[PDB]
Every structure is written in structure tokens, then in C-alpha cells.
Design a protein around this nucleic acid. Structure first.
Ligand SMILES: [Zn+2]
Ligand SMILES: [Zn+2]
Lengths: 115, 905, 62
RNA sequence: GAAGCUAUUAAAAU
RNA sequence: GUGAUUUUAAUAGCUUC
């Protein structure tokens, strides 16, 4: 079953790497807090992920959401680290303005780190 | 002087609405059940004198004084009942007087329209005749009169603001519900027995008719509220009447309630909501459907859960995860699931400390989305309104669709043969349309048309019993893993299994014992999976993008092993309503048309479409279809096994995580095209919609006009079986099924249908019609059936106008006339002018493409239009040319193509 | 038919652009897709030629 | 020639 | 990256009348 052997080795590897990439500290300080040790899945990244990715469609949404070098979301502070357009090119925070907006390749993606 | 009498101690300026003492005649809706007539329809009320109230500015207001004239018995009787019930604050003021000696009962400060009028207007919607609805919306400050000047103001797809216009009535409906519960408490305390009807409650919330109530001992009074609540149910979610429960206390001027994020149960909150709003509903409500008693109880308890789940935060739903250990290494896995419809479900086989994971457990833990979500980054997507879980990758992926490839040789041949000239009936209208990088997310955002829809439970419970009769001639049940047939083993296995191989890899690596173990595991646990949205590269006449869902192999194996027996039986049966599996070749089209014509007495034909069918399917209807399919497992499975299979199916296809561009989203609901039973479930949904349309059409007719005594008694027993008997009446279900088969014959294939119906009954309102279908789809599917895509054919010599994208002609073959399915010439020509691969441009090694295309075009040679026969003859000359330069003769001779439509003898 | 010829040349030109790999520029790809879809959906031959020349200008730019 | 089975390529439909 | 199911044709094999 050389096929079985290879596929087994594959799934195993994946799981263990995601496990090593688990945020042990924050995951634990919230799972045990739970009354029966059971929590909804949708709140795990919302309360434990250390990186935030925001995809903004136009400039009006940019101004309403990510105005400035820091912003608040999910009851936390996020420090903007790198803004990238739809072409995987680095965009500076001084180029996102109303005058220069039509010359940018929307949408843009903002990567932020938790405070 | 009548004016001042009606005026009374509470003096006010009264505008006589009619001719003073004469009773005003109005056209209003009533809920009726007598010994001579029954039904929810519009009648004439000619026993009430209206007197609209003025104010200081002498301008009219939404207040009326309704004076009724009746007999002295009802005078003394209704005086006693009102004296008994006067203390209740939810009862309108009554004045009892008599002066010419004729008794009069004056109700004070009533509104023009009632809850029955609102329910009828919203459940029998007809654009171009919605005067009552427009007047209600204007009167109660829902919108302005200028709102209706815009076109398409009423439909949900072109005008999404109508949702906000309708939701403006939620607080009024909620106040009506509260006053109804107060009235029921007062009746119980005072010891009175009677039925509650919508047409006795004005749009403020007061009750004013006591003529049929009976007095008994105090403390033990019984209010009957089944018809009231069941008819009111569809509008509780249309107007979003329970939005005030999400604020602090229950007022709209306070901020939202801040729930704890780690909370998922809400069982006591659901029980409190049920006790507050539906206190006197006499059937047991299970917040968690795992404690239900059968499939008729699961639907009843999930209908309440779809309404109650709109109060709770959206992050409390989905998989419930726990931390287990693999040889001392912590591991987070899914252990339950909180459903919007089924409640909280907990897996029965969970081991915290385990070791040495085998293939099956590795497969389950890889298909589980919990580890993926917990490892991904947080994502905030502003391009869509769908819930966003996480970004698995570190960047967003954009997918583009390529243009089609031009078959220049074939186009030059067609041009040289005299085709494609100005002023022709045949032109190319089908192409490959290219899409930019936002097409995937733009098409995924179309799930925004799915809304939580509560449905009449008493009507759905009867409709499901009627629908189940259409699936009595089939064999079902579970089969072993070695009895499973897989057509294509070289397809994709889904996420994340597409990173290591195709479905053939899994089906080879997993033995029959492992597959049976996995199937047994699914009957005691819930396995959530991930579906992947892919773009389909096909030819079409529209510039819209096509998207399909790739279900995971873990779900696919179990679903196949659960359903193929019934699916194969359906696909093999011939002559039934569902025509999946029947071929149009060798007289199949003729046989299907003869079967559908059957022996209807005044035949006319009719067809309809489903706008946004897959993206707007109600969850309740999807669950109903799944239960109807699963009803065949009475021998091989128990109640627990069937419930857990249903929960697995819901968590896997109904509302699960969707990967779209490397990011995880939450699907609101609908149907996932790509599930093992998509076409079979769409056939069940279509039959259900047709049956409920027929039921509404029959119940909406005035019973005093149906000259047929048999049909009048049928209507009486129909109303009885919906709103007065809680147990299934098998004899009446059989009678109604026979009636439908006699007068409403259907040919069903997924969401495409052709109906041969009795015209006299339709014109008399005894069977469903286009308007009934439009109303049903409005108030259930939250869509608008425009009558432009629906057709009616009064002559059966010409067959259906269109079925499965095929037309029909009556032609002489041999010594008899048969029906032939000819296609669209533009589609046939575009199939050959454009291809999807650069290899297929050379037709010398692709003669089979043109052979199949000529097989599809042969019928055009019998069309009265020469430009159609021209297309077929053009396909033939090209086949010859290639066959020739390449180097049998059958593919050039017309005989090979004629015998593909002649009966196989 | 003076219309189907334009509708075929638009398909050929978009295929040429895709092979040349203009999809690297999302702006250019979106513009070309819009022009090609509009040409395919056009009913009159008047604006179709204008949009075809506009699309061909993209190829001529390089 | 006849019927059935298997694999490979292709076409149409919801 | 490319789903579910149904029908049909071509090609090449394997039993059979
Ligand atoms: Zn129940
Ligand atoms: Zn079973």
C-alpha cells in the first residue's frame, strides 16, 4: 500500500505543523475559562490570532475602516505593518488618498499585528 | 342622532364613512370555518357602520367607530362575555346601546385594516393590485407615496430596500403578539372557551368579537390559537418582529445586549422566548432537536428555532471545539455543533486521551475545519456581507476565466456555405465570457439573497405528507461499501484532500472495512467539512460567472453509501412524475409527453422558472427534502441514527465553512450544487412548491361559489386536515393525491417542470395557476416570479414551449406523428464555432464532437424554416470533408441520425 | 455578417492578450474583459467597431 | 453478424 | 484550480449466439 503509506505521512505532517503554529498561551487561557471546556470555533481566531488581514474595496471603505496607522477592531488595537495592492506590490500609506485613488489597483490588503 | 349615540361619553368629532346609518360594505379577508364553508379568503362584510374620527385640525386619523347590528340573543350573550373580559387591557372598548330598539354594539377606536388583511396582503401578493398593502405601508409610516413611483419597488432582488420597508412593521406585529398572549391569559382566568381568528384583531392589538365564545367555570378556560399562530408565522420573519429582543430590556432606544463570547447554549433563552410569545401553543417545543420523537416533530421544533436564532449573536453557531491530547500533545478538535435549526448536538464518541491515530481518524481530523481555522489569521473582508472566519494563506488569491478558442476552419466553412449573413434568423448568441479576478467573490456574495424564513407549520406538515406519496414506488435503504458505484474516480477530493491526490487515491487506500467503520461513525457523531468554490469554464448566452461547490470526500463517501439505493431506483423507474434517468432518444420524448398529457379533461400546458433557485432556497424546505429522502430507512436505521445522519448532512452541505480564494467564510444556507443528491432534492422542492401552490389556490376560493359539491367538501376537509387535526389522515392524503394526479399532472426534472392542467378548474380557482405560483414563491422563497419567463400553451399539438432547453415539433415518422426535441440553432452553431482547448480546434482527430453535435441537430431538418435544416446539412458536409482529407460513411449518411429518434425495434 | 466577424475578432484578440499575459496588470485585464464582453453582447454594429478599435489599441500600445 | 461486459476519448441536459 | 447526477456516440478489449 505504498499509496496508503505516502498519504498517511502527508496528513500527519500537516496536523503537527498546524499544532506547532497553535497560539498555545492565548488558546489555553480561553478554553479552560469555558465552563465545560468547550468554545465556539468562530471566536478562536477572533480572540487568539496575532495577525489581521483586511481587504478594502474602495477608498471610502478605507477611510471608514483603517483610517491612520492604527485602528480598533474586535475590541483590540492593531498596528498596520504592510499594505499591498491586488498585484502583490507594496503600497505606501502616503499614496492612499482621494486624489491618487483612481491610480491604485484596488482592492488593497492591509496586514496588521495585535497590540 | 346616530352620530352622537356612537360619540358617547368619550365625545369626539365623527366623520360618517358611508351613508350614515347604512352599514358600510367592504372587501376584507376572513378566516372561516362553518358547517357550510371554510377557507382563508376575501368576502363582503355588510353588517357594520364605520365612523372615522377627526381632531382639532378636522383632518382624519387612523381611528374608526364600527357599529354592528345583530339579534337580541347575541346582544345579551356578547354583553355578558364583554362584562367578564372587560378588565383585560388588550380588549377594545365596547358600547352597548339600542335606539331606532334594534340592538347595536359599537366598537371604539378601531383601525381600518386588521391583521387578517395584512396577512392576506403579504401572502397573496399581486403586483399591480397591491392597493391594501400600499395603503397600510403609507398609513403606518413605513414609507412615502413617492416610494412606489420607482419601478420594481416590490421585489427583493432589484430593490433590497423593501426589506427595510417591511421591517418597519416588526414592532407593531410584536405588540400584537404581546396583546394576544395577554388576551389568552385573561380568557383562561375568566373561564371562557373560544377560537382566536386574525380578522377579530385590529392592527393595534385589540380584540372585539365575542359572539362565538362559551362561558365555563373560572380558572379553566381554553383559548384555541393554532390557525391564528400558524397563519401569522410567515410574517414574523418577513417583518423581523423580534428585533427588539436583541436590545437591553426590550426597547429599541437602548443599546444592544453584550453577550459573553464563550456562550453557545441559549436553551433557557429559547424557552423564555417561547413562553413569552407562544405561551398557549399546545405542542411540546424541544429547543434541541436531538430530543425530538420523529421527523414530523423535528420540523415543528426547527421552525421555532429558525425564528429564535435571529436574536442571538452570529458567532455562537457552528462547530464546538475542545482540546484533546495525542500521546501528551495537545490537539484541538470539533466535538459538537450548534445549529440555527437543530440546536446543540454533542458527539457520543469523544476520547480525550488517545494514541496512535489510524487512517480513519487521521482522515476525520484532516477534514475537520477546526485546526485550519485555529491556525489561520483573522480576516476582515469588506467586499462581501458574509461572515468571515480566517485567512488560511498569507495573501488573497484572485481567479480569472480565460476566453474561448476560435474554430476558424469551421467558421470559414459556414461562411462559404452561405451562413452568417445580415438579416438572418440564425446568429451566434452563445460565447465564452471572460471574468476578472473579483468574479469569484462577486458570485459568492450572491448568497445574500438567502434569508431566514419561518413557514406555516400546519400547512408544511400536510404538504410533506402529500409530497411523500410521489415517492412510494421506490426502494431505499443503506448498502455496504462494496455495493457503491463511483462513475468518475478521477475527480477532485476537495479541501484539503486535493493536495495529495484525486478521489481514486482515497477509494484505493480505504478498504471496505474502513469505509463501513466511517459510515458507522457518522451515525453517532457530527463531522463538519469544508466546501470549495470553483469557477466553471462553460459556454453561455449571458455574461454571468458560473460557480460550483466541491464537497469533501469524507462527506461524499457517506452520502453515497446512504443514498445511492434510492437514487438508482428513482433513475431507473419509468413513467413516474420525476423523469430523471429517461432518455429523449428512441421515442423517449414522445413517451414522456404522452405520459404527462395522461387524461386531463380540458388540457392546457404551463411552465415556470425559479429565480435564484440555489441561492435562495429556504433552510426549512431543504431540511424537509432531506427528511423526505431519508424516510426510506425505516428498517435499517433507528431514530438516533437518522437524526445524526440529518445533522451530518446539514453541517456538511446546508451551512458550513466555504473556502473562496484561500479564505474561510460561513455559508448562510441554500443548497450546495455538488452534493450527492442535488438534483433529487431539487425535484422534491419543486413538487413541494407545486403542492403548496395548489393548496393555497383551493383554500383561497369563496366556498359559496364552487358548484361542485365534491370539490366543496374537499375544500372543507382540506381546511379541517390542516388546522384542526394534528394526526395524519391517510385517507384524505390519498384522496388529495388522486385529485392532484387527475387534474394537475406534472413532469418534474430538478427545477424544471411541465404541467398539463384542467383549464376550467384553473379559471374557477380550483387548481394552481401562474398567479398562485407567484404568490407562493413570494411569501416562501423571498423571490419574485416575473410572468415574462413563464409560458402557457393552449394547444397540445404543439408541445411544451420549452423543457430542458429543448423545443417540440409534431412530425410524421413512418405512418404516425411523434414529438421531437429540437435545440437552439445558435447554441448548436456556437458549440462548434468555439471550443475550450487548443487541441479541439483541429477537427480531423475530433470527428466525434461533430458527430454528437449533428446527433443533437438532426430534428431541425423537419422545421418549416429552411435556415434550421441548413445548420443540420452544414454539420453533415463538414463531417464528410474531415473523414475524407483524413484518409465510416455512416456519419455522412442521414440514416445514422434518423434512427437515433425512431423507436428501437 | 459584418457583426459575427467583429465578434470573432474580439475573441481572437482577447486570446492573444491572454497569451501575451496582460493578466499581470489587473487594471488592463479588467478593461480588456469589459470591452470584450461588451462587444460580444452588442446588438448594433456601430459601437462594436469603436469598442473593437479601443481593444486593439491595447495591443498596439506594446 | 448477434447480444452483454470493460476501459479510453467526446457531446448534451439540470 | 476545475462538483453532483443522467443520457448518448466513437474507439479498443473480454464473454457469448
Ligand atoms: Zn420536537
Ligand atoms: Zn439506513
Amino acid at each position: 500500500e505504498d499509496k496508503r503509506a505516502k498519504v498517511t505521512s502527508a496528513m500527519q505532517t500537516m496536523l503537527f505543523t498546524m499544532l506547532r503554529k497553535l497560539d498555545n498561551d492565548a488558546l489555553n487561557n480561553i478554553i479552560n475559562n469555558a465552563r465545560d471546556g468547550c468554545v465556539p470555533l468562530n471566536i478562536i481566531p477572533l480572540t487568539t490570532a496575532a495577525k489581521l488581514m483586511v481587504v478594502i474595496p474602495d477608498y471610502n471603505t478605507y477611510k471608514n475602516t483603517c483610517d491612520g496607522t492604527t485602528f480598533t477592531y474586535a475590541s483590540a488595537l492593531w498596528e498596520i505593518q504592510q499594505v499591498v495592492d491586488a498585484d502583490s506590490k507594496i503600497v505606501q500609506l502616503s499614496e492612499i488618498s482621494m486624489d491618487n485613488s483612481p491610480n491604485l489597483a484596488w482592492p488593497l490588503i492591509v496586514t496588521a499585528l495585535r497590540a | 342622532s346616530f352620530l352622537n349615540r356612537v360619540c358617547g361619553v368619550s365625545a369626539a368629532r365623527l366623520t360618517p364613512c358611508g351613508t350614515g346609518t347604512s352599514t358600510d360594505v367592504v372587501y376584507r379577508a376572513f378566516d372561516i370555518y362553518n358547517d357550510k364553508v371554510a377557507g382563508f379568503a376575501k368576502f363582503l362584510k355588510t353588517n357594520c357602520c364605520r365612523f372615522q374620527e377627526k381632531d382639532e385640525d378636522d383632518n382624519l386619523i387612523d381611528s374608526y367607530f364600527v357599529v354592528k347590528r345583530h339579534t337580541f340573543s347575541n346582544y345579551q350573550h356578547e354583553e355578558t362575555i364583554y362584562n367578564l373580559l372587560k378588565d383585560c387591557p388588550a380588549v377594545a372598548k365596547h358600547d352597548f346601546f339600542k335606539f331606532r330598539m334594534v340592538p347595536h354594539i359599537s366598537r371604539q377606536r378601531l383601525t381600518k385594516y386588521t391583521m387578517a388583511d395584512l396577512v392576506y396582503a403579504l401572502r397573496h401578493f399581486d403586483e399591480g393590485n397591491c392597493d391594501t398593502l400600499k395603503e397600510i405601508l403609507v398609513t403606518y409610516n413605513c414609507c412615502d407615496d413617492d416610494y412606489f413611483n420607482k419601478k420594481d419597488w416590490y421585489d427583493f432582488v432589484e430593490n433590497p430596500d423593501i426589506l427595510r420597508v417591511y421591517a418597519n412593521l416588526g414592532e407593531r406585529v410584536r405588540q400584537a403578539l404581546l396583546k394576544t398572549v395577554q388576551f389568552c391569559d385573561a380568557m383562561r382566568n375568566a373561564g371562557i372557551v373560544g377560537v382566536l381568528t386574525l380578522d377579530n384583531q385590529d392592527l393595534n392589538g385589540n380584540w372585539y368579537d365575542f359572539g362565538d365564545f362559551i362561558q365555563t367555570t373560572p380558572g379553566s378556560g381554553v383559548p384555541v390559537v393554532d390557525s391564528y399562530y400558524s397563519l401569522l408565522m410567515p410574517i414574523l420573519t418577513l417583518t423581523r418582529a423580534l428585533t427588539a429582543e436583541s436590545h437591553v430590556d426590550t426597547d429599541l432606544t437602548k443599546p444592544y445586549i453584550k453577550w459573553d463570547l464563550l456562550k453557545y447554549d441559549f436553551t433557557e433563552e429559547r424557552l423564555k422566548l417561547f413562553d413569552r410569545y407562544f405561551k398557549y401553543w399546545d405542542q411540546t417545543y424541544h429547543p434541541n432537536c436531538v430530543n425530538c420523537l420523529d421527523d414530523r416533530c423535528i420540523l415543528h421544533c426547527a421552525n421555532f428555532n429558525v425564528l429564535f436564532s435571529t436574536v442571538f449573536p452570529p458567532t455562537s453557531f457552528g462547530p464546538l471545539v475542545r482540546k484533546i491530547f495525542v500521546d501528551g500533545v495537545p490537539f484541538v478538535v470539533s466535538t459538537g455543533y450548534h445549529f440555527r435549526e437543530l440546536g446543540v448536538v454533542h458527539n457520543q464518541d469523544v476520547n480525550l486521551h488517545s494514541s496512535r491515530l489510524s487512517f480513519k481518524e487521521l482522515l476525520v481530523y484532516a477534514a475537520d475545519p477546526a485546526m485550519h481555522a485555529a491556525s489561520g489569521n483573522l480576516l476582515l473582508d469588506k467586499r462581501t456581507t458574509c461572515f468571515s472566519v480566517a485567512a488560511l494563506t498569507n495573501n488573497v488569491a484572485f481567479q480569472t476565466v480565460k476566453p474561448g478558442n476560435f474554430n476558424k476552419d469551421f467558421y470559414d466553412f459556414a461562411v462559404s456555405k452561405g451562413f452568417f449573413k445580415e438579416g438572418s434568423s440564425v446568429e451566434l448568441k452563445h460565447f465564452f465570457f471572460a471574468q476578472d479576478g473579483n468574479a469569484a467573490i462577486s458570485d459568492y456574495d450572491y448568497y445574500r439573497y438567502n434569508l431566514p424564513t419561518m413557514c406555516d407549520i400546519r400547512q408544511l406538515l400536510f404538504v410533506v405528507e402529500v409530497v411523500d406519496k410521489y415517492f412510494d414506488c421506490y426502494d431505499g435503504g443503506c448498502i455496504n461499501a462494496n455495493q457503491v458505484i463511483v462513475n468518475n474516480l478521477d475527480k477532485s477530493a476537495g479541501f484539503p484532500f486535493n493536495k495529495w491526490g484525486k478521489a481514486r487515491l482515497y477509494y484505493d487506500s480505504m478498504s471496505y472495512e474502513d469505509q463501513d467503520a466511517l459510515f458507522a461513525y457518522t451515525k453517532r457523531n457530527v463531522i463538519p467539512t469544508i466546501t470549495q468554490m470553483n469557477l466553471k469554464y462553460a459556454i453561455s448566452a449571458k455574461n454571468r460567472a458560473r460557480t460550483v461547490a466541491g464537497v469533501s470526500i469524507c462527506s461524499t463517501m457517506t452520502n453515497r453509501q446512504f443514498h445511492q439505493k434510492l437514487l438508482k431506483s428513482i433513475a431507473a423507474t419509468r413513467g413516474a412524475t420525476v423523469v430523471i434517468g429517461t432518455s429523449k432518444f428512441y421515442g423517449g420524448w414522445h413517451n414522456m409527453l404522452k405520459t404527462v398529457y395522461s387524461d386531463v379533461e380540458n388540457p392546457h400546458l404551463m411552465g415556470w422558472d425559479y429565480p435564484k433557485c440555489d441561492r435562495a432556497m429556504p433552510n426549512m424546505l431543504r431540511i424537509m427534502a432531506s427528511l423526505v429522502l431519508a424516510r426510506k430507512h425505516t428498517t435499517c436505521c433507528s431514530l438516533s441514527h437518522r437524526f445524526y445522519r440529518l445533522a451530518n448532512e446539514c453541517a456538511q452541505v446546508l451551512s458550513e465553512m466555504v473556502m473562496c480564494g484561500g479564505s474561510l467564510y460561513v455559508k448562510p444556507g441554500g443548497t450546495s450544487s455538488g452534493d450527492a443528491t442535488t438534483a433529487y432534492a431539487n425535484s422534491v422542492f419543486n413538487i413541494c412548491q407545486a403542492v403548496t401552490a395548489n393548496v393555497n389556490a383551493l383554500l383561497s376560493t369563496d366556498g359559496n361559489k364552487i358548484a361542485d359539491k365534491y370539490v366543496r367538501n374537499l375544500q372543507h376537509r382540506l381546511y379541517e386536515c390542516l388546522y384542526r387535526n394534528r394526526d395524519v389522515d391517510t385517507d384524505f392524503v390519498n384522496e388529495f393525491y388522486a385529485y392532484l394526479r387527475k387534474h394537475f399532472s406534472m413532469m418534474i426534472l430538478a427545477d424544471d417542470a411541465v404541467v398539463c392542467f384542467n383549464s376550467t378548474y384553473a379559471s374557477q380557482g380550483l387548481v394552481a395557476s401562474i398567479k398562485n405560483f407567484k404568490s407562493v414563491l413570494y411569501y416562501q422563497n423571498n423571490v419574485f416570479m416575473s410572468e415574462a419567463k413563464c409560458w402557457t400553451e393552449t394547444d397540445l399539438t404543439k408541445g411544451p414551449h420549452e423543457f430542458c432547453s429543448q423545443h417540440t415539433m409534431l412530425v410524421k415518422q413512418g405512418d404516425d406523428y411523434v414529438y421531437l426535441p429540437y435545440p437552439d440553432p445558435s447554441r448548436i452553431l456556437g458549440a462548434g464555432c468555439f471550443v475550450d482547448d487548443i487541441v479541439k480546434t483541429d477537427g480531423t482527430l475530433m470527428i466525434e464532437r461533430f458527430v454528437s453535435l449533428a446527433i443533437d441537430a438532426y430534428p431541425l431538418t423537419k422545421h418549416p424554416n429552411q435556415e434550421y435544416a441548413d445548420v443540420f446539412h452544414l454539420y453533415l458536409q463538414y463531417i464528410r470533408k474531415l473523414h475524407d482529407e483524413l484518409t465510416t460513411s455512416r456519419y455522412w449518411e442521414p440514416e445514422f441520425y434518423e434512427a437515433m429518434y425512431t423507436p428501437h425495434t | 455578417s459584418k457583426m459575427s466577424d467583429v465578434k470573432c475578432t474580439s475573441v481572437v484578440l482577447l486570446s492573444v492578450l491572454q497569451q501575451l499575459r496582460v493578466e499581470s496588470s489587473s487594471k488592463l485585464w479588467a478593461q480588456c474583459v469589459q470591452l470584450h464582453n461588451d462587444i460580444l453582447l452588442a446588438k448594433d454594429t456601430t459601437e462594436a467597431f469603436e469598442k473593437m478599435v479601443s481593444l486593439l489599441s491595447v495591443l498596439l500600445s506594446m
